[PDB]
Design a binder for this molecule. Structure first.
Ligand SMILES: O=C(NC[C@H]1CCCO1)NC1CCCC1
Ligand SMILES: [Cl-]
Lengths: 306, 305
């Protein structure tokens, strides 16, 4: 039993991290097979920050303007190309530590692990979610660009995020491993701001189901709600609307606990109205929204504590 | 910027985990050099666990009674012995992925990373604190025994914890890697309860410093206090006493922020007496106590391995 923010074991990703330097700029790259992936903004100088013409800057680079270092080894770059906002450096050696891997673009609400790195070396691992406003609430310092987000479902590493920048409110933005930004952001230093963020309702509901599995019952009630009435209330607290898709996703947790999804929705409406009254749920005095239905089933027993 | 509960990268430990089976029991072992470490309770039947005589159970066993699997490879056990509540299985092959390591016993208040494992496969990593009552608040299912906890210093892994059991309240108890329990626990199926727990004051202060570094400042005030005055308040709230060593350890953060420890102590006094008055700190409505001063400096400085 117990319930914790849990990251994937980072080892398979650790063996892929390298350092990339171009000019005076050093950041992280991801070395899979014979390609190193990194943010294309590595090729910018100071006057290129507002309105870089990436095609123009890249054509001006030779292979030997890129210093790539894997531990103590220099890897020789033998080719370069750009894909959207990611740079792809061809090197003369395939990474012998390359895991089984794939690239996946995720949707808001999904969770993943981040391996934060500086100078091609891992600093730490933690769990994040893609926020509804397409940002992530990370922990990143200068030098952390090129750090990646990943899942490991069943021996294969699914890469879903690469870190590019910090926005003015202190939240983070980046791309998939095909170089497409999450959300409306661009790799320019022009003024940009995240939209107002909301709470990931389906994830909160999942976490309430986790609480019940771990033996909490204090927040349950005898009421139910229509889906529509729930949404009208929830939106007044800056909660995301719950779709029928979301209702379906919670069906297994519903069945394992014997509490219907709209039954649980009524608990959540009550909690938003009353607060916790000095109590906690699973070690929090807030409603947690960074655990998916899938995370909860994976982390929990298949036996409820009644 | 930003601040998260962050584990050490687990790769160096992932390469050390194996599966150990004795009779019908499978759990995890730690393979370092030519020895596999695991909980001694692996050898017990259900009946045994009520009142075990480990000495007697162990002499009765031989090498071939222990099945050690590292992925698809069977290790040959060539010897066995017990040290406290840990079993040591000598194997015919040194682990070629053995990292630079040592065995270290930690103190209550200190944090570490747990690599939760099942059937010898790493499953998840998370950061824990050793509670004042010597439990950890972990996340463990059946098959997790023998999972380990550790810190990293440069390239050196310090192993500090091996998971043995769950207590009735859902908290967890285990040993150091020399088999000595943390806390007043024994490895048998009998009635055991954790003592009443306390809050780790120096860690709360470190977290308030992390909040300030990240621009979260509402709880700061013009006041200061004395160790004596604070401790009298704190002890009233089941907060551990703040020692002078604790104050010295916070010195780096006090200097980096311009909030002196006793200045920050005055803020924490008010939070205890008054609550958070509807606010949050670093996205929490509780006072978090599972980050050490060292944790905060490391995370906010960007130390690497
Ligand atoms: O439908 C999903 N995301 C998009 C929604 C969430 C906020 C508004 O739009 N599902 C995610 C949660 C479960 C795993 C992925
Ligand atoms: Cl997704």
């Amino acid at each position: 039993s117990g319930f914790r923010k849990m990251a994937f074991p980072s080892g398979k990703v650790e063996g892929c991290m390298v350092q990339v330097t171009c000019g005076t700029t050093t950041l992280n790259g991801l070395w899979l097979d014979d390609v190193v992936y990194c943010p294309r903004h590595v090729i910018c100088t100071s006057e290129d920050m507002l309105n870089p013409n990436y095609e123009d800057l890249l054509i001006r680079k030779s292979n030997h303007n890129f210093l790539v270092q894997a531990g103590n080894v220099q890897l020789r770059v033998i080719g370069h190309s750009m894909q959207n906002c990611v740079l792809k450096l061809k090197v003369d050696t395939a990474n012998p530590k390359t895991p089984k891997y794939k690239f996946v673009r995720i949707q808001p609400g999904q969770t993943f692990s981040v391996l934060a790195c500086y100078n091609g070396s891992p600093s730490g691992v933690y769990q994040c979610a893609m926020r509804p406003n397409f940002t992530i609430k990370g922990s990143f310092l200068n030098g952390s660009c090129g750090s990646v987000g990943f899942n490991i479902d069943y021996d294969c590493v699914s890469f879903c995020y690469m870190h590019h920048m910090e926005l003015p409110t202190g939240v983070h933005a980046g791309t998939d491993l095909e170089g497409n930004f999450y959300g409306p952001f661009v790799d320019r230093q022009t003024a940009q701001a995240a939209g107002t963020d909301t709470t990931i309702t389906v994830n909160v509901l999942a976490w309430l189901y986790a609480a019940v599995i771990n033996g909490d019952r204090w927040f349950l009630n005898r009421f139910t709600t229509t889906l529509n009435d729930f949404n009208l209330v929830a939106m007044k607290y800056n909660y995301e609307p719950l779709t029928q898709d979301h209702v379906d996703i919670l069906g297994p947790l519903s069945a394992q606990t014997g509490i219907a999804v709209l039954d649980m929705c009524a608990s959540l409406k009550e909690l938003l109205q009353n607060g916790m009254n000095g109590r906690t749920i699973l070690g929090s005095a807030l409603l947690e929204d960074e655990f998916t239905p899938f995370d909860v089933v994976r982390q929990c027993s298949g036996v409820t504590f009644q």
